[PDB]
Each structure stands twice: as C-alpha cells, then as structure tokens.
Design an enzyme around this catalytic site. Structure first.
Site, PDB file in Angstrom:
ATOM      1  N   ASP A 299      43.397  14.401  20.933  1.00  0.00           N
ATOM      2  CA  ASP A 299      43.513  15.813  21.292  1.00  0.00           C
ATOM      3  C   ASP A 299      42.357  16.607  20.661  1.00  0.00           C
ATOM      4  OD1 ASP A 299      44.435  18.354  21.947  1.00  0.00           O
ATOM      5  OD2 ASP A 299      46.275  18.189  20.775  1.00  0.00           O
ATOM      6  N   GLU A 493      39.706  15.265   7.308  1.00  0.00           N
ATOM      7  CA  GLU A 493      40.457  14.682   8.424  1.00  0.00           C
ATOM      8  C   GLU A 493      39.595  13.744   9.244  1.00  0.00           C
ATOM      9  OE1 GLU A 493      41.524  18.021   7.691  1.00  0.00           O
ATOM     10  OE2 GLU A 493      43.299  18.480   8.929  1.00  0.00           O
TER      11      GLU A 493
END
Length: 550
Positions: A299, A493
């Site tokens: 995503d 991340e």
C-alpha cells in the site's frame, strides 16, 4: 559493538515495547481509535461476535469498572454484511479477539485473560495481518514463544468469527483480508512448542489447520476473489463506498472531478456516494482496486494502481500453493488421510490436495512465467494478459516451493540482478516503477522492505542458493546497522536500498535477528565496523568470497 546493542534491544526491550495483552483495565486504552473522527468515534467501542456471551460479559464488566472512559460494548450481527460495515463507518469499534480460560486453583472460579499479541509499531494497538507472521518469527528467536502462539490463537478466532484474517481487528476492516501465511506460521510455532511430543502443541496445530482450510475454501478459492477461467485468485474484497479511516483529504482529488460532473460540493458528493445515490461505475471500480490494494499489503505501488483487483499476482498464488502443500501434509499425518470438513461434510484426501497444488503450479507457470527475463509476472484476468512489472515478490515462488529447479536457476541468474541494489532487494526494478513527476509510492524502487527480504532469504536457501542469501543478508544487515549508528539509535519503517544519509518496527526488528542467523563471526565483526558490502567482500580470500556468491 553496534550490531550487538541493537540485536540486544530488539530481543528484549522492543518486543516488550510492542506486546499487547487485553485485560479489564487497558481495554479503554487499546480501543481508543483516532483514525476516524465523527460523533460515534468519540467513545472507545468494542464489538463482540454474536455467539461469545462469556466474552460479552467480560467487556461489559470491564466497561463499568473504568466508566469514565464511556466505553461502549456492542454485539455483532450473526451475518456480517458489506452493507452493515458501511453503517458502522461512523460508530467504529475494536473487534474482540481470542481469550484464554484461567481458573482459580482452590476456588475454581473462571477468569478471562486475552492471549497476547504484538503491534507493528509503538504507534499502534491493533493486531495486524501478515505483519504478525514475520514478527512471530522474531519472537520465536527471542524465545518469547507465548506471544507467537498468542497470535495464532487470534488468527483462528478471526477466521472463526469474522470469517477471515483481517487487515487489523477493527470494525472498518471487516471486509478486507491480508496475504495468507497461517499454515507455516502454525508450523513454526508447532515445532518450537515440541512437535508431536507436546499434546497442547498438537491440539493447536489441528485447530490452526481446520481454520486454515476454512480460510482457503471460503476466502481465496471462492468468488469474487477466484477467477474461474484461469483458476487463480485475486485480491478482490467486498465493501462499500469510501473507506472511512483514511486521511480525510486522501481521495479529495480523485473525487472532485465527479463531484463537479454531478454539480455538488465535495462533501455532498461524498455523502451521496456512500448513500449509494451515484451511478458512476468507474468510480465504483476505482474504489474496488483501492480496497484491493489495501488487501495486498503493498500500500501502495504502481504495480497495482487501478489494476490490483483484476490481477492474479504471483504474490497470492504463491502463498496459496504453500497452503495446498502444508494442508496435504496435515491430513496424511494427523487425520489418517481422511479430512471431512465439519461445515459442508466434504471428504478430501491428501493426494487430492497435492493434486490441487500440481495444477496451481502448471497454471502459474502458464500465465506468469517468463523463461527469457527470469521473472514470474502477474497475470491480468480482465484484459487477459500478462504484466511487464518486475517485482521482488517473484521470489515468493521459491519461498512456497512451486518453482522448478530449472526455473529458480533462471531467476537467480537473470532476475535477481535487476533487483539487487546496494542494501538488498528493491521492491521492483527501476524500469517497472516508471518515472517520477506521479509521486513516489512507498512499495516501489528505490525502497526495499523487510518482508521481501525475509521471504527471499528463506526461499533461496530452500532451492539451495544459501551462498546468495548470505550476500543479500549482509547488504541488508549492513544498511540497517549504519543507520542505527548514524541516525543516532533509530530504526526506520522502510529503507532506501540505493543510498544512505524508539520502539522499533515489528518486522524490521524481526528482519534483523533473522538475518543475523545467516552471519558468521567474521561478518558480524565487519558489520560492527560498518564496512560497506563492496569493501568487505573485496577484503576476503576467494575461498570465503565464494560464501557470498562471489
């Protein structure tokens, strides 16, 4: 020594920083959810399955104890429908999850305490989807096995009461799934528990496989997700109208054109769409693919922009192959080769399951394999045509074990070089991303992601290319270390695997411990010194340079 300090901090403090466990006092804390902002979202709310009364009483007892939270506790419909979810978009809740029975040993009084789980980052509270597989690998190396088994217990419950493994256990995710791993996530927690010798283990294995088969039969090989023509599956979830929990401005730019074709404000056109009063069908299709992207867990990416819901990806169909083989195993080993499904009295033999996998393999090789360039491209099922997009996920074929010895050799030789950047595997080649102007998507070149790395490692090491794992695992571990040093004690991340400038991040953390499994004493020492991969391979006797495919 930096690789020892980070590794130490993952295995001890970060995993605890990310554990969650539901009891009668944090329920308020967990269920608080900002992502949605309407009236109904002002009080923390938990939703319970219709047939879990003992658990309803729990969260109600809980809501009376700290009543100042104004916690609301609602039973769920027996039949959870896309139309229903669309309604509770304004009254969102945290879904109840698994719960283990604990008894007083001289009085005998039953107590409920929630099985424990892990969040992907200190900035979350929900049990997420495929993230939880990777994290469970790390938790098992850090010998926090209670939290790994905890999450299998949750995934059984999710499948048994909400009908699927959820993006995360919140009301507004009830229509989406995530990439399925529960088979091998079950296996590793089984093996670490004792295997056949731990009876509690053998009970969990069976439950997780009964539930796994339910997921396979009723989600992935099941319309709408299943393409009947080719036999393969797509990320194609249900669900109505605009996803609520997004940034409010998110779709504002794609919505604005239609809103003005229909002569109203942006807000009115939003409400009128959610209320079903707009027959703009290509807008209905846009949101199909968006919801489909949110299910792939990539995503987002230009591999899936506006096409995702029609794509039978190598991603999902490699995972399903794994399900088919792991299931044949479970039946021939624990069910005397006769599994009859308690829901529909369907009698399957393990030979039959293997046969299912054999045809998947042939189909995947048919529509997806490209013996020239080395990749497994995704196949489009509406346009009925293959893609030109070189994805790091091509290696999932090896993780799952459906590629031939011949196919892998072609992939290592021709495709792995198009993807191997300084610090590991980019999510996709530079060609396939295209140009930027067209903002950059976070699952595209130049980014590289923990899950892609972890699966390619195990997949290469499965087909016998461990020498190639070692090289890839170095470039990753290095680039993560030099960041923890430079960025002054911080984990990130996503990483740019092309160039480089307080709780950790779930599968990033876990990516580190699992790559260190692959490193010898010499390599760890070179890592502590922050020696970039070219310098370090260069510094090696050609016998040992052979250990890294060089």
């Amino acid at each position: 020594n930096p690789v020892n300090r980070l590794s130490r901090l993952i295995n001890t403090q970060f995993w605890n920083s990310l554990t969650r466990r539901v009891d009668l006092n944090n329920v308020g804390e967990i269920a608080k959810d900002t992502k949605i902002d309407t009236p109904g979202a002002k009080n923390p709310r938990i939703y319970v399955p219709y047939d879990c009364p003992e658990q309803y009483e729990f969260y109600v007892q809980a809501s009376q104890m700290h009543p100042s939270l104004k916690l609301e506790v609602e039973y769920l419909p027996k039949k959870i429908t896309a139309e229903y979810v669309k309604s509770v978009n304004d009254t969102p809740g945290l879904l109840a999850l698994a719960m283990e029975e604990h008894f007083n040993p001289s009085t005998g009084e039953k107590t409920l305490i929630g099985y424990p789980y892990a969040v992907p980052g200190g900035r979350f509270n929900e049990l997420y989807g495929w993230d939880s597989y990777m994290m469970a690998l790390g938790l098992l190396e850090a010998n926090k096995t209670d939290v790994a088994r905890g999450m299998v217990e949750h995934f059984i419950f999710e499948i048994n009461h909400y009908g699927k493994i959820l993006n995360a256990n919140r009301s507004y995710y009830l229509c989406r799934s995530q990439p399925p791993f529960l088979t091998e996530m079950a296996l590793v927690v089984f093996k670490k528990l004792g295997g056949r010798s731990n009876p509690d283990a053998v009970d969990l294995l069976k439950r997780a496989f009964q539930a796994s088969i339910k997921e396979y039969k009723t989600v992935w090989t099941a319309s709408p997700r299943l393409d009947p023509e080719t036999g393969l599956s797509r990320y194609h979830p249900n669900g109505l109208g605009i996803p609520p929990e997004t940034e409010s401005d998110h779709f504002d730019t794609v919505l604005l054109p239609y809103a003005s074709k229909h002569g109203v404000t942006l807000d009115e056109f939003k409400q009128l769409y959610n209320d079903g009063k707009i027959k703009e069908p290509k807008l209905d299709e846009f949101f199909l693919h968006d919801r489909g992207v949110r299910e792939s867990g990539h995503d987002t990416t230009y591999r899936f922009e506006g096409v995702c819901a029609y794509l039978a990806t190598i991603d999902l169909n490699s995972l399903l192959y794994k399900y088919e083989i792991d299931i044949a195993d479970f039946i021939k080993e624990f069910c005397d080769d006769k599994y009859e499904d308690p829901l529909d009295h369907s009698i399957t033999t393990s030979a039959m399951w293997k046969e299912m996998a054999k045809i998947r393999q042939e189909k995947i090789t048919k529509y997806m394999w490209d013996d020239e360039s080395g990749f497994f491209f995704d196949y489009n099922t509406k346009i009925k045509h293959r893609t030109s997009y070189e994805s790091a996920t091509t290696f999932w074929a090896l993780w799952a074990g459906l590629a031939t010895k011949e196919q892998a050799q072609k992939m290592v030789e021709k495709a792995l070089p198009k993807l191997e950047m300084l610090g590991g595997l980019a999510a996709c080649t530079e060609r396939s991303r295209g140009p930027i102007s067209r903002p950059i998507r976070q699952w595209d070149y130049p980014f590289g992601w923990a899950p892609h790395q972890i699966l390619a490692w195990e997949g290469l090491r499965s087909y016998g290319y461990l020498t190639v794992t070692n090289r890839l695992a170095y470039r990753w571990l290095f680039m993560m270390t030099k960041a923890f040093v430079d960025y002054n004690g911080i984990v990130v991340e996503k990483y740019d695997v092309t160039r480089g400038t307080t709780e950790g991040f779930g599968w990033v953390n876990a990516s580190y411990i699992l790559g260190l499994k692959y490193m010898n004493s010499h390599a760890r020492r070179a890592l502590g010194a922050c020696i970039p991969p070219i310098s370090f391979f260069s510094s090696l006797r050609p016998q040992e340079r052979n250990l890294y495919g060089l």
